[PDB]
Write a protein that binds this ligand. Structure first.
Ligand SMILES: CCCCCCCC/C=C/CCCCCCCC(=O)OC[C@H](COP(=O)(O)OCCN)OC(=O)CCCCCCC/C=C/CCCCCCCC
Ligand SMILES: CCCCCCCC/C=C\CCCCCCCC(=O)OC[C@H](COP(=O)(O)OCCN)OC(=O)CCCCCCC/C=C/CCCCCCCC
Ligand SMILES: CCCCCCCC/C=C\CCCCCCCC(=O)OC[C@H](COP(=O)(O)OCCN)OC(=O)CCCCCCC/C=C\CCCCCCCC
Lengths: 78, 81
């Protein structure tokens, strides 16, 4: 079933985001990807967009108090 | 630690990509997001980029024999590629 799997993924994402090593690794990977294709071409000013957005997403996943809500927002749960 | 968690996430994504309802739902959500902020401004021609990339990503995850590789590519596991 896709809804239980989505809930598990969101739970894992929140747990993972509560670790600084995760944030550092994802930041370095995305900073690298911003300098090369495909992101270099599909996302202008990629590095600045990353610097601004990645903390927002980290906080978003560190604050969500309802996985089912997110999975419904994406269309995987009712 | 984060390596087992990353492998579990990749395994779940691989499992999900085999169901077509997942693909349709993700397409619907991303088409919605492409028409509004922030993606409307951060991704020029968002809808076309989506139409081109989503199938590639679906296939990439449907042809994955070992999650470790992805987790190694992002730096959460010390080996995999
Ligand atoms: C108005 C300047 C236009 C751009 C100028 C470029 C120079 C750099 C200026 C920096 C600021 C630029 C801000 C523009 C950001 C991009 C906005 C954008 O993406 O548009 C989309 C967005 C809609 O997207 P959604 O929210 O998803 O739709 C559903 C919501 N119901 O709509 C907007 O454009 C945002 C609002 C635009 C504000 C336009 C300003 C109008 C000014 C009229 C007043 C007259 C001038 C006042 C004095 C000017 C000062 C000297
Ligand atoms: C669709 C996200 C990426 C693929 C997800 C794969 C399924 C994994 C399980 C789901 C993980 C959690 C999903 C995260 C997205 C949830 C975002 C959300 O619900 O809120 C929308 C949020 C604003 O929230 P609110 O203002 O409170 O609500 C009003 C709605 N505008 O807006 C956004 O999220 C904008 C950013 C959307 C993410 C864009 C992801 C990048 C897509 C790029 C183009 C396509 C690439 C193809 C990727 C294929 C993925 C397998
Ligand atoms: C090989 C491809 C791998 C694809 C990834 C695998 C899927 C695994 C799941 C990944 C989860 C992705 C999470 C998506 C981001 C969720 C964004 C979010 O929810 O945060 C909300 C927050 C919005 O909030 P506000 O509107 O500002 O209002 C305040 C609300 N608190 O989001 C943001 O601000 C940032 C959104 C922009 C980032 C997306 C840009 C990515 C561009 C992709 C280019 C296409 C590449 C092709 C691949």
């Amino acid at each position: 079933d896709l809804c239980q799997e989505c809930e598990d993924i969101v739970h894992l994402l929140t747990k993972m985001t509560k670790e600084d090593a995760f944030q550092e690794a994802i930041r370095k990977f995305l900073e690298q990807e911003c300098d090369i294709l495909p992101l270099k071409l599909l996302v202008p000013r990629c590095r600045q967009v990353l610097d601004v957005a990645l903390p927002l997403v980290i906080d978003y996943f560190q604050s969500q108090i309802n996985p089912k809500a997110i999975c419904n927002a994406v269309g995987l749960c009712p």
